[PDB]
């Protein structure tokens, strides 16, 4: 008949397919964490710090659908803020629960640990409200179940962080268990009928008139869950389909109508021209950040641009506030084939040619590696690429179908990917034990969050950790200060990290040549996700993908401009 | 003639005795960082992450007087916030300079990396305003020197963090170099003459009357720079002098008038009675947090209390807004000996007896270790104790005179001390190469900030890193859940950390018996700060100082109270 508020939270999380919970303990949340162990199928990650935990919750949400991190008042929550900000910026549904002092301790304004010593128990909640879609600070047991529900719903449907503060005393108070028998409503509200019809009719007419329409899938294609619809749209229409860096993975790169990675002026000439020559652009989930776009360098030649977004539509100069793309895309599928029936298929640019055979002793170079990497990938892989050369280079890698890419192009917080790898590996394990998780992280970025490797080991997760050793911050050196000491890093013994963190079942590998790369990555046992691996990749100091060389100059100029 | 705004900043920092600058680079601050190398006597730490950099700037400021951390917009600054908030809570003057997008970039609202994608460039500044004494976001070159000077002054005189945003384009513009020839005013404003005279005269008359006065030194004694005056006051009066956990180190423990560590009901009975039986209490810099006070358990039996504070005075029920203790204490030196001339000295409580001789093979215990540690310490040592058993246990250690203690009793962010150790070691090196820096950090806390050892190594800093291996979060286990899996940690090979981060000149030791403890710590070579050292200390899982056992129960009850 009755259940603790704490246990109710974990029962709800289990109902919405969140099965791993991130964060660190502190006195203000200990009684709440107890409740995790009362719920079958729920686990506590036991993160090495709160920032890493927040990055992990982000990785988990991207793969699983949403996530939860629990921290402690002041010291835990403030540690996590950069992770939460990144989740807000990139539209990732992370529920951040904070164990806060009891109602009675607040009432009496006790000078407790983890406060600013001024009796203000609102300050951290206030700070988090800036990077949250909504917040709740629970003060009474009576409406607490509904507020938990609302927070979980909002996290999921808006795909942005939500803040939920739970006083220590309230987690052990009882609420009706019967509440758990009605599901949380996880569904979008239908669109305005008249506005949605206008948009659909208008698109269909633009489609009928188009001779070279193109589809461009960007971040929100993935973040707001329209990949299936976009795939159908591609198949029914036969229109060329291109993807952005931030949306890479949202469309199948083995589809015969897939045209490549569009990055404005930084695209392959053939890709740039194929996109920009379009007489109708179907833009799915645009997020036009500097790195996503070669510093705002799109040069569409047509006015006929349809922008599909999670919360609104735009057609040419006309805006349709509130009209959600999910339902527009679904309903379009009914009549889009008819609208496209006169289309005569325009050729797409061909895939970048495979690397030519070279001697086994050929030193590894970035351009070669990114082009070679597609050989190692397989359908189902989660492929994570850190801000730095890795994020820029993965744009050149051809993905198998059904690859989930993670690249934090907008927020661009180095170190993110160590934590994201952990969360992705949890979620991937829960989905399918044979799903591989593959990380490319710079030597510089690894340093910020290196301890989260510990948490991978403790749970026997088996990601592939490729560390690009180029002796410092190459991306920065290419922006400004190529020999500046601030761009250099202390030299670590990367392959000793796993055993240092107590790993027992693992492999470590170093590759420095083309021969070594091929030998390792083509190897049958290596391709099985049987244990955690670290691969140290030795690369030259100033070597970078060409797109990064160019973007670095553009970014330098933007910042230096008077 | 003219100097860049960026170089002006570093010239000012040099003038105010800030010679190490903390933080991490990002495109928005790279041109600024260049200017560090243009100023002789200035260096860039090259921190391994921003949170650790903020903890470091905090440790540096505690030893040196104030500090500066530079981060990048969004990703850098938010990472630092837990460090900044602890500095705000514990009154440590840290100048947080953030490299922000150029004026033209903000005006056109470019969708740049490290933004929330909504074109709001004020949001992170807003967030930091909550944990800063003042803020400045520089927009006009003409007033930028004055604004820098204002921020530096405020950081130092108020001993609280200040936020300074510097658009990337502005750092390279010129300002008049002759401004540098007039020093920043770093002095307190004189007190209101009449109010101060009233306070002084009243205290001198209370003094003349008291038969059992005592002096109690707390956190703000050291944080607000009145340690010399307080010591001199003890010497002139010969009144018994006690210290709090947060103030420990502020007064000299090898002084015939030193009475012990007062912690309300957690005190030695002799110490508790000596303080609470007083007929006059001279309280210097009180900060009555839960852990500092045994959960608010002071039981003074007099109302004759003089509270000295940085920004005001209190005498019994009478408050004197704005009367700063610095000048009150200094001027009391003139006539307080005469006022105290009738005082017949009351005996002080005896110091805890030395440990009894025990067999060399006796396994190490916490209580023995804290009571032995005083043998190893020397005058001038910086002694840093992490939240957990270390912070509570260090209360039991006798300090040599002139010991700088660091224990973050109020904010209590585990991991703080790895960074604080770096900051303190930089400062100590600048003050006196022979000054030792000694850390006691738990195995759990080390995990959150472990990478900052890298930065110690790269600069050839030589602290003593004592890591307390008790297989998890013992403090938490004693509060709630002694066998809870959230209180356990992944087991690391601690002694491999130094070589894993590239150390070449170092020692590692393990101690597990009293014999091993004594042989190592009494060793003449060990006692020289000739290289970085890590000492793994093997301790039992549930072993703790008695004061923690008691505090842990009081904390649990406070959180659980309905
Ligand atoms: C958290 C954080 N911090 C800092 C930063 C910066 N960064 C980056 C950028 C781009 O972002 C800018 O600048 O803005 S990048 C970097 C470096 C990295 O390195 P690595 O990892 O090594 O890579 P490569 O390139 O070499 O491969 C930096 C520092 C951020 N972001 N975040
Ligand atoms: C950042 C951060 N996080 C978390 C936390 C919590 N904690 C602590 C306290 C007291 O604070 C509470 O509870 O709140 S403590 C801890 C643990 C530690 O462990 P170690 O280091 O290992 O030590 P010993 O010696 O005791 O064992 C925790 C987790 C904070 N704070 N912060
Ligand atoms: Mg690198
Ligand atoms: Mg421990």
Curated annotation (Swiss-Prot), chains A, B:
Presence of the UniProt keyword Ubl conjugation in the record: yes
Residues carrying Omega-N-methylarginine: 160
Pathway assigned in UniProt: Fermentation; ethanol fermentation; Amino-acid degradation; Ehrlich pathway
Catalysed reactions, as listed in the record: pyruvate + H(+) = acetaldehyde + CO2; 3-methyl-2-oxobutanoate + H(+) = 2-methylpropanal + CO2; (S)-3-methyl-2-oxopentanoate + H(+) = 2-methylbutanal + CO2; indole-3-pyruvate + H(+) = indole-3-acetaldehyde + CO2
One Gene Ontology MF term: magnesium ion binding
Superkingdom of origin: Eukaryota
Compartments, as annotated in UniProt: Cytoplasm; Nucleus
Cofactor: Mg(2+); thiamine diphosphate
Pfam families xref list: TPP_enzyme_C (PF02775), TPP_enzyme_M (PF00205), TPP_enzyme_N (PF02776)
Record bears the keyword Nucleus: yes
Protein name: Pyruvate decarboxylase isozyme 1
Organism name: Saccharomyces cerevisiae (strain ATCC 204508 / S288c) (Baker's yeast)
